[PDB]
Amino acid sequence: ASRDFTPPTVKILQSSCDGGGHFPPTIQLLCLVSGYTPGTIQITWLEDGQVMDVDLSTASTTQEGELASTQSELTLSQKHWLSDRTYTCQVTYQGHTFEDSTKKCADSNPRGVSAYLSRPSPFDLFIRKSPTITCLVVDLAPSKGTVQLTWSRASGKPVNHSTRKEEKQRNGTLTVTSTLPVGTRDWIEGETYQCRVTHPHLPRALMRSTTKTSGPRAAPEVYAFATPEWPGSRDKRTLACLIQNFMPEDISVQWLHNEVQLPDARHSTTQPRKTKGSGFFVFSRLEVTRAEWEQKDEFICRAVHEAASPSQTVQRAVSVNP
Amino acid sequence: DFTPPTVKILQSSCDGGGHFPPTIQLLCLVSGYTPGTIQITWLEDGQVMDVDLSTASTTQEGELASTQSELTLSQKHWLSDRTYTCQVTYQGHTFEDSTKKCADSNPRGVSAYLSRPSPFDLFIRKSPTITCLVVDLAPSKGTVQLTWSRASGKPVNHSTRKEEKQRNGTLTVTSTLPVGTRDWIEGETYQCRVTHPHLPRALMRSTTKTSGPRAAPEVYAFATPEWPGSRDKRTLACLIQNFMPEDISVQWLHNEVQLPDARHSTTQPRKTKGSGFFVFSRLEVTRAEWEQKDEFICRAVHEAASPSQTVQRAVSVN
Ligand SMILES: *[C@@H]1O[C@H](CO)[C@@H](O[C@@H]2O[C@H](CO)[C@@H](O[C@@H]3O[C@H](CO[C@H]4O[C@H](CO[C@H]5O[C@H](CO)[C@@H](O)[C@H](O)[C@@H]5O)[C@@H](O)[C@H](O[C@H]5O[C@H](CO)[C@@H](O)[C@H](O)[C@@H]5O)[C@@H]4O)[C@@H](O)[C@H](O[C@H]4O[C@H](CO)[C@@H](O)[C@H](O)[C@@H]4O)[C@@H]3O)[C@H](O)[C@H]2NC(C)=O)[C@H](O)[C@H]1NC(C)=O
Ligand SMILES: *[C@@H]1O[C@H](CO)[C@@H](O[C@@H]2O[C@H](CO)[C@@H](O[C@@H]3O[C@H](CO[C@H]4O[C@H](CO[C@H]5O[C@H](CO)[C@@H](O)[C@H](O)[C@@H]5O)[C@@H](O)[C@H](O)[C@@H]4O)[C@@H](O)[C@H](O)[C@@H]3O)[C@H](O)[C@H]2NC(C)=O)[C@H](O)[C@H]1NC(C)=O
């Protein structure tokens, strides 16, 4: 009887706060797939879109009459819940996916507006040779008046045309991004750029400025390494790179493989920190697969930095096999 | 042989933007108990709610019953900050739990954080501590009050308290509480409670040991080759990875003695691509040191390592 087919639905319940309104020390999320026509079912949990380890959750399926029911429970620390991460219950049933998401409920009062202004990245300055700076305005209330965002130079010389994006966010706020192309000689020779943000509902105008970092210079050292093969790493292995003793701290790190620049999401790179003596260091970690090194067994860690000579780059290769 | 009832309340979640749904369900669960007479009653600010507002049902599996009751509230009532109590009467005796909407997490822009003990303090020094940090307070009058307690109500020791005004005009308050080694390992919950004169209600943070799976770290240690112009220095790098949970301590040793903490730097734990976390540790060394003895030890202390919560790896310059 195909007329009796009952598709699954998804809802998430959570641990309640106590009689004082306070979070418990751990949070349970309970994904409920109510009565559906019995069939093969799998539940995957996502943390900000990344698959979570199945070890962190349980799952149970019962059948009552002609209908099945499945629940999965995920447990989180209070610290992680307070970090405003979003969790997704992803249900796969007979080749069709359902899902639902949740995060900590929003606070009763809205946050004030904030603004951020970046310097150009070394990769854009020296590889692409098309540098830009970005002014980012967050926590705006939508459906108000549109926000004015104006660029100027301390020298009084003209700015180029910028591009502007406005995007409604899941939490109901608005973000505005403005990206300004800058002259390469202008930037290297110390020009100061300002982003000025105004709106009638703001208390005052917001102003941010940016300019090349002053002070001493020093070129980066680069070292690439591979972890050994062992029973836990037969068809994957971990590569690492240490980049150190450079100044100032602005740097771009990439990994290259078989004439491809790998996506930024493939690796994890730390924030620049001070060496005991002079300069900064960063570490980068890249997990690679057997199919990649069977394609070509050469992985390159590359740093882009203004003091690297002769062409603002330093790089080192590593191989995983003999 | 007897399994008493327990009470827990679950509620409708907010969506991916943190928004409330049109109605709020509260679900009172009495799961896995020796069968007997049972009633579930809901109170709103201590008064019995109409019988038609909730439905209870009971099932049995093996030697144990389970009971649940669901109450539906309007968004407006939930947001009014009323207290809802699930009152369970089993064999004539009463068990209660209560809930209300979660209080703001960053009232007036403040943040508060509460740590777990470091593994070195817990397993090596056997003097574990936890730390409660409150940031972005106003430099107003009226001292910020910070109080410690255990979920079990057992006593706590005195704590430290430190304030200092920051360069940005804010005030941070920090307190560190010593905890019992056995008390922590057996799963006690510790609570930090902060009251400021300008805050409308008390702010609380709670911490306890992890409830997830455990996995010991892998430890790998490397020495940099000589870089042109730096004959008398080398850098040692240690990668520690795939451990769970994320709490970890890192030490370096040379000549059987532990080096001062100021000698090295360790990154904060970050997720791998799959299960577990990694950190990097960095140690600069001198020619005098490796010519004296060319062996340096990167040691990790972690609750999942056996038999003594330690895993380590040595490295040599040559
Ligand atoms: C409602 O929801 C929205 C989101 O949906 C949320 O909005 C976020 O709000 C927070 C703050 O409230 C914003 O966080 C800030 O982001 C700033 C911008 O960061 C991006 O751009 C950086 C600049 O990149 C350019 O320049 C560099 C340098 O030259 C160059 O390398 C680049 O190539 C590029 O050209 C970039 O560095 C950054 O990437 C880093 O950070 C991410 C995330 O941490 C990390 O994953 C990367 O690996 C990389 O390390 C990112 O791409 C940022 O500058 C700013 O940082 C300042 O503040 C923090 C703490 O606040 C300090 O620690 C730091 O030192 C700086 O002082 C801050 O992180 C975030 O961008 C919003 N997200 C949006 C708009 O999508 C609202 O808050 C929500 N509201 C409520 C009420 O809930
Ligand atoms: C004004 O300026 C102040 C600076 O003075 C800004 O305050 C900082 O704000 C940021 C962001 O809000 C804070 O970052 C947060 O820090 C949390 C604490 O991390 C620190 O402690 C961790 C735990 O170590 C303790 O506990 C272990 C185990 O018990 C023990 O071994 C130790 O003894 C320690 O006692 C460390 O892991 C960590 O490295 C830090 O040392 C952190 O947990 C959060 O995730 C978050 O990163 C920062 O701490 C604030 N700094 C200060 C000094 O208050 C403030 O934001 C500025 N205001 C504005 C408006 O910008």
Numbering used by the authors:
A (entry chain B): 225 to 253, 253A, 254 to 545
B (entry chain A): 228 to 253, 253A, 254 to 544
Task: Provide text from the study.
IgE plays a central role in the molecular and cellular mechanisms of allergy, and is a validated therapeutic target in the development of new approaches to treat allergic diseases such as asthma. It exerts its effects through its two principal receptors, FcεRI on mast cells, basophils and antigen-presenting cells, and CD23/FcεRII on B cells. The Cε3 domain is thus the critical domain for receptor binding. A branched, bi- or tri-antennary, high-mannose type carbohydrate chain ((GlcNAc)n(Man)n) is N-linked to Asn394 in each Cε3 domain, as seen in previous crystal structures of IgE-Fc and Fcε3–4 at different resolutions, and with varying degrees of disorder.
The IgE-Fc structure, space group P21212, with one molecule (two chains) in the asymmetric unit has been determined to 1.75 Å resolution, which is the highest reported for this structure. For example, in IgE-Fc chain B a terminal mannose residue, Man 952, forms a hydrogen bond with the main-chain of Arg342. Hydrogen bonds mediated by water molecules are also formed between: Man952 and Ser344, Ser341, Ile474 and Ser475; Man953 and Thr492. In contrast to Fcε3–4, there is to date only a single crystal form of uncomplexed IgE-Fc despite extensive crystallisation trials (authors' unpublished observations). This may imply that the Cε2 domains stabilise, through extensive contact with one of the Cε3 domains, an intermediate quaternary structure (between open and closed). The IgE-Fc data however shows a two-state unfolding, the first event, in the absence of urea, at 55 °C (Tm1) and the second at 64 °C (Tm2). The latter is taken to be the unfolding of the Cε2 domains, occurring after that of Cε3 and Cε4. We show here that IgE-Fc unfolds in a two-step process, the first involving the Fcε3–4 region with Tm values similar to that of intact IgE, and the second involving the Cε2 domains. Since the Tm1 and Tm values for IgE-Fc and Fcε3–4 respectively are very similar, the Cε2 domains have only a marginal influence on the thermal stability of the Cε3 domains.
